[PDB]
RNA sequence: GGGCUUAAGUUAUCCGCCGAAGCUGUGGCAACCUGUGUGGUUGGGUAGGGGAGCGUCGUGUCAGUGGUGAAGCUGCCGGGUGACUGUGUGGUGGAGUUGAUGCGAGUGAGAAUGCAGGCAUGAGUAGCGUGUGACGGGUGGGAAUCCCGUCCGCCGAUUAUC
RNA sequence: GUACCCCGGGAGGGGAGUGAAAGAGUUCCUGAAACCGGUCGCAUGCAAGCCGUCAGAGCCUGUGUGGUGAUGGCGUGCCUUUUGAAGAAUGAGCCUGCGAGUUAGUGAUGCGUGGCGAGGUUAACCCGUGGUGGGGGAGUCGUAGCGAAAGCGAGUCCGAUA
């Protein structure tokens, strides 16, 4: 998001008149702030919002994301969702009967999982995400987890004492 | 996020002109005039809320002095008396009686005639 | 609600003072009293409550130390030079109804309300008054004790 | 919320009440110069309103004259009314759209001028809702 | 000299309510067979007639 | 100021009353202190410091809602200690938007001889830029101001011609 | 994109048609305020008005509350700048819109709050073409001070191992 200051704004070189002895206020710019058409005073700029979490609070707001739909018995693991080839009506069918349609699925295999990954990749209630990419944000906005067996044995293997 | 002032903007001007919605001239019409002519408004207003407890002293005090010199007694002597008496009825209802039941107001000065130090 | 009066609710009657013999301050005091009708527990400043007032022998009002020759009334027509003025002896002597009727005003205060009541005072400087149908009552200036 | 009985201008000026109106939308003069003779023809009987705007000195007689003419037969045509006797019920001049012109004047300055212009209506009834 | 202030409405509106004509009078033209209104002391438009019932006399060709 | 010495003047003295948003009575609100059943003290305020909020726009989430009519505009009837507001009830209008809780601001205007537009005031006022036009007829919905004609006047080292 | 008819020279309007809507008729969505008017209610031609406010009759209305307001009291605008302004000091004709405390730094220094805690924390960059996640401890602050410094060290420096 950007504007146009005062010194942006095309034209407004010259003063409009002179200083004196028009009974006019005086007037520096026709591109002045409090003139039609001028320059935006305290506009936005371009910028950054990335704020510096230290990494101790971001795994930590992660783990207790995750422990309280863990003690709320809101995560289920599955060997794989759709068998062969991939349909979503499968994995539609496995997700329902693990419970409702507000959900989130980790297979982690980042590079060869196309089976699950382009299975619930079109429910628009299932948000899929590899077990390195689980962030706070999504596990709050996720009512149920299921992950992969490799899912969650991936996490696991990433991030244990 | 750019901001439109006009929605949020008008609805003082409203309450204002709704104030002002008996002055004359700009005062009734104009939001900058109904403006200064509230601000006096409000000051007259709190003013004249304190003042009104002595504008109708007085003229409960008048109404009194009225009926008791009608019986040949004076405003000061009819309250001192009432007070030696010890009838606390308070200029108000003094006046009521007056202008209503004017032989409870005619009773109540020969009390303050006889509560009298007659001194 | 305080008591206030409604129009023509207030009947207003006719007093009539001899000035014989009567300072002009007395008379004056009593007949602002009585047209703004400050003796009526009906009273009200902005509801003419008042009574009507003839002054008869306005011609031998009372005047103290040497007033009658050194108490001068002014009058200015409102242009340069226009100020006339007479003793109030002399204008006892001529024209007593504008003496009475100035003194009264001066005493009365100063409202469109008052200008109108001021035209109930009738001021005539002989023994006798035009007023008979009006059957004016004879009124005595009396003071209350203590 | 929008629905049934729609505003109109007969509805607002007559109410179901017999009668009818013409409105002359921007008229080429001014408001105030039209209501110079409006306020003189309101009120009045039609046919006499209409023969003493074609001697009024005006220049604002004849748009007022033509409207009231035609007030006249729209009444005579929509409600079988005769024009001897309808009288002028309501009439007034509104402002319309005024056009700004520039005057040039001493020292190289230059003056606004305004050519204004007015709606005019009038509103004829059956003399017989005079009294009523 | 130039105006000081704003003229009120209630004085703006005293002084133009001046501005005004009265209306024309207009009198019957005597000519039965014309009947029309005309000016006083002045030839019927449509008749182009001037005088009483009686002596008539033709004034305007219209 | 009226008027006043027949004090409504001065003075000593006595008895009453009037008189403030002061004090007291009664009802509501608030800050602070205190042992925490009580109570006490306090609450004019510019520069300025501290604290807590209203309204606008965007937005995460949840709950929604909308042609059986959103926004906006505009009445009425109400509400709050304030900014303001109703989950009251109409009108206009025609496609969005409400509540909760966070997040982000081009977040609030009466002043800057502020900027842009619209419109008043003066005012139906001053002016309409050197002057000579008259009349008959015509045209036309409409003619002092167009056309034709006749009188008359004006320029003519230029009001001509190139 | 208003056939046809009527008044009109037209402009414009009145009927009628089209359309869900024409008071969406091309100056066309919504249509605010200044500003200009018609109608109705009340007041107003003996009155001295920072235009209000408190008291208050009458009339109108009663959609039983609202509109108006005779008359009485009290009452010298707003802002700026000032010892002091209603000021005959400044600015503002009016409305609508716009118009001024912002943003960037692994800046400086406090506070609130959250994390970790004798430790805290990464920068560049690499991986995640899948982001907001992971890696990266190079550095940097804390961990001992005192001295110009060599240096010494819970001491050090001036001093004479005072
Ligand atoms: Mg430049
Ligand atoms: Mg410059
Ligand atoms: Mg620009
Ligand atoms: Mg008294
Ligand atoms: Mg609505
Ligand atoms: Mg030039
Ligand atoms: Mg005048
Ligand atoms: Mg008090
Ligand atoms: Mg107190
Ligand atoms: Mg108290
Ligand atoms: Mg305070
Ligand atoms: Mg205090
Ligand atoms: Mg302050
Ligand atoms: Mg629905
Ligand atoms: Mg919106
Ligand atoms: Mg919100
Ligand atoms: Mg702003
Ligand atoms: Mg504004
Ligand atoms: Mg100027
Ligand atoms: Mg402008
Ligand atoms: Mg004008
Ligand atoms: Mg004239
Ligand atoms: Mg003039
Ligand atoms: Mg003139
Ligand atoms: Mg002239
Ligand atoms: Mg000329
Ligand atoms: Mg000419
Ligand atoms: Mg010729
Ligand atoms: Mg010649
Ligand atoms: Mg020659
Ligand atoms: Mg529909
Ligand atoms: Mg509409
Ligand atoms: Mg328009
Ligand atoms: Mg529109
Ligand atoms: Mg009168
Ligand atoms: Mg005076
Ligand atoms: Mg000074
Ligand atoms: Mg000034
Ligand atoms: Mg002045
Ligand atoms: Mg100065
Ligand atoms: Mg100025
Ligand atoms: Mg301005
Ligand atoms: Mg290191
Ligand atoms: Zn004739």
Same mark, same amino acid.
């Given at each position: 998001?950007?504007?146009?200051?005062?010194?942006?704004?095309?034209?407004?070189?010259?003063?409009?008149?002179?200083?004196?002895?028009?009974?006019?206020?005086?007037?520096?710019?026709?591109?002045?702030?409090?003139?039609?058409?001028?320059?935006?005073?305290?506009?936005?700029?371009?910028?950054?919002?990335?704020?510096?979490?230290?990494?101790?609070?971001?795994?930590?707001?992660?783990?207790?994301?995750?422990?309280?739909?863990?003690?709320?018995?809101?995560?289920?693991?599955?060997?794989?969702?759709?068998?062969?080839?991939?349909?979503?009506?499968?994995?539609?069918?496995?997700?329902?009967?693990?419970?409702?349609?507000?959900?989130?699925?980790?297979?982690?295999?980042?590079?060869?999982?196309?089976?699950?990954?382009?299975?619930?990749?079109?429910?628009?209630?299932?948000?899929?995400?590899?077990?390195?990419?689980?962030?706070?944000?999504?596990?709050?906005?996720?009512?149920?987890?299921?992950?992969?067996?490799?899912?969650?044995?991936?996490?696991?293997?990433?991030?244990?004492? | 996020?750019?901001?439109?002032?006009?929605?949020?903007?008008?609805?003082?001007?409203?309450?204002?002109?709704?104030?002002?919605?008996?002055?004359?001239?700009?005062?009734?019409?104009?939001?900058?005039?109904?403006?200064?002519?509230?601000?006096?408004?409000?000051?007259?207003?709190?003013?004249?809320?304190?003042?009104?407890?002595?504008?109708?002293?007085?003229?409960?005090?008048?109404?009194?002095?009225?009926?008791?010199?009608?019986?040949?007694?004076?405003?000061?002597?009819?309250?001192?008396?009432?007070?030696?008496?010890?009838?606390?009825?308070?200029?108000?209802?003094?006046?009521?009686?007056?202008?209503?039941?004017?032989?409870?107001?005619?009773?109540?000065?020969?009390?303050?005639?006889?509560?009298?130090?007659?001194? | 609600?305080? $008591?206030?009066?409604?129009?023509?609710?207030?009947?207003?009657?006719?007093?009539?003072?001899?000035?014989?013999?009567?300072?002009?301050?007395?008379?004056?005091?009593?007949?602002?009293?009585?047209?703004?009708?400050?003796?009526?527990?009906?009273?009200?400043?902005?509801?003419?409550?008042?009574?009507? *007032? *003839? *002054?008869?022998?306005?011609?031998?009002?009372?005047?103290?130390?040497?007033?009658?020759?050194?108490?001068?009334? $002014?009058?200015?027509?409102?242009?340069?030079?226009?100020?006339?003025?007479?003793?109030?002896?002399?204008?006892?002597?001529?024209?007593?109804?504008?003496? *009475?009727?100035?003194?009264?005003?001066?005493?009365?205060?100063?409202?469109?309300?008052?200008?109108?009541?001021?035209?109930?005072?009738?001021? $005539?400087?002989?023994?006798?008054?035009?007023?008979?149908?009006?059957?004016?009552?004879? $009124?005595?200036?009396?003071?209350?004790?203590? | 919320?929008?629905?049934?009985?729609?505003?109109?201008?007969?509805?607002?000026?007559?109410?179901?009440?017999?009668?009818?109106?013409?409105?002359?939308?921007?008229?080429?003069?001014?408001?105030?110069?039209?209501?110079?003779?409006?306020?003189?023809?309101?009120?009045?009987?039609?046919?006499?309103?209409?023969?003493?705007?074609?001697?009024?000195?005006?220049?604002?007689?004849?748009?007022?004259?033509?409207?009231?003419?035609?007030?006249?037969?729209?009444?005579?045509?929509?409600?079988?009314?005769?024009?001897?006797?309808?009288?002028?019920?309501?009439?007034?001049?509104?402002?319309?759209?005024?056009?700004?012109?520039?005057?040039?004047?001493?020292?190289?300055?230059?003056?606004?001028?305004?050519?204004?212009?007015?709606?005019?209506?009038?509103?004829?009834?059956?003399?017989?809702?005079?009294?009523? | 000299?130039?105006?000081?202030?704003?003229?009120?409405?209630?004085?703006?509106?005293?002084?133009?309510?001046?501005?005004?004509?009265?209306?024309?009078?207009?009198?019957?033209?005597?000519?039965?067979?014309?009947?029309?209104?005309?000016?006083?002391?002045?030839?019927?438009?449509?008749?182009?007639?001037?005088?009483?019932?009686?002596?008539?006399?033709?004034?305007?060709?219209?």
């Amino acid at each position: 998001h950007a504007t146009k200051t005062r010194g942006q704004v095309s034209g407004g070189g010259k003063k409009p008149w002179r200083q004196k002895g028009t009974g006019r206020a005086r007037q520096g710019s026709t591109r002045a702030p409090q003139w039609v058409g001028g320059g935006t005073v305290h506009g936005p700029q371009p910028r950054s919002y990335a704020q510096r979490t230290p990494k101790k609070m971001v795994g930590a707001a992660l783990r207790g994301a995750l422990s309280d739909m863990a003690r709320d018995n809101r995560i289920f693991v599955v060997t794989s969702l759709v068998d062969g080839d991939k349909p979503s009506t499968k994995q539609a069918k496995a997700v329902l009967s693990g419970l409702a349609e507000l959900r989130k699925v980790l297979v982690v295999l980042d590079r060869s999982d196309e089976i699950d990954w382009l299975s619930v990749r079109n429910l628009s209630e299932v948000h899929v995400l590899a077990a390195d990419q689980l962030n706070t944000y999504d596990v709050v906005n996720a009512r149920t987890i299921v992950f992969s067996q490799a899912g969650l044995d991936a996490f696991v293997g990433a991030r244990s004492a | 996020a750019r901001v439109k002032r006009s929605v949020n903007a008008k609805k003082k001007r409203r309450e204002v002109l709704d104030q002002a919605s008996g002055y004359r001239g700009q005062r009734s019409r104009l939001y900058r005039k109904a403006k200064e002519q509230t601000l006096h408004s409000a000051t007259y207003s709190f003013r004249d809320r304190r003042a009104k407890k002595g504008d109708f002293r007085s003229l409960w005090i008048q109404r009194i002095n009225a009926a008791s010199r009608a019986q040949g007694m004076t405003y000061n002597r009819f309250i001192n008396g009432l007070k030696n008496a010890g009838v606390e009825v308070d200029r108000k209802m003094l006046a009521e009686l007056a202008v209503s039941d004017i032989n409870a107001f005619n009773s109540l000065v020969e009390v303050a005639k006889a509560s009298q130090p007659q001194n | 609600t305080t $008591y206030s009066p409604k129009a023509g609710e207030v009947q207003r009657k006719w007093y009539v003072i001899d000035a014989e013999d009567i300072v002009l301050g007395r008379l004056a005091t009593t007949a602002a009293n009585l047209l703004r009708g400050k003796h009526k527990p009906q009273y009200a400043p902005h509801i003419d409550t008042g009574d009507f *007032v *003839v *002054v008869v022998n306005a011609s031998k009002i009372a005047l103290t130390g040497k007033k009658a020759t050194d108490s001068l009334r $002014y009058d200015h027509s409102g242009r340069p030079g226009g100020l006339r003025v007479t003793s109030i002896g002399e204008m006892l002597a001529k024209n007593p109804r504008r003496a *009475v009727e100035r003194a009264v005003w001066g005493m009365m205060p100063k409202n469109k309300l008052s200008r109108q009541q001021l035209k109930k005072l009738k001021v $005539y400087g002989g023994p006798e008054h035009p007023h008979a149908a009006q059957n004016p009552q004879p $009124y005595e200036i009396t003071q209350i004790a203590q | 919320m929008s629905k049934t009985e729609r505003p109109s201008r007969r509805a607002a000026l007559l109410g179901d009440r017999p009668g009818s109106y013409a409105i002359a939308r921007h008229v080429r003069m001014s408001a105030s110069k039209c209501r110079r003779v409006i306020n003189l023809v309101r009120g009045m009987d039609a046919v006499d309103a209409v023969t003493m705007l074609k001697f009024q000195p005006q220049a604002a007689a004849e748009p007022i004259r033509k409207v009231i003419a035609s007030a006249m037969a729209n009444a005579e045509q929509t409600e079988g009314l005769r024009a001897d006797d309808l009288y002028i019920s309501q009439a007034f001049v509104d402002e319309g759209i005024t056009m700004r012109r520039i005057r040039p004047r001493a020292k190289g300055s230059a003056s606004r001028i305004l050519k204004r212009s007015a709606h005019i209506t009038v509103v004829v009834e059956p003399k017989e809702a005079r009294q009523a | 000299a130039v105006p000081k202030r704003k003229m009120s409405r209630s004085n703006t509106r005293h002084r133009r309510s001046q501005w005004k004509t009265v209306a024309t009078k207009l009198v019957t033209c005597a000519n039965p067979a014309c009947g029309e209104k005309h000016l006083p002391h002045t030839a019927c438009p449509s008749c182009g007639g001037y005088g009483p019932r009686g002596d008539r006399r033709q004034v305007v060709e219209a």
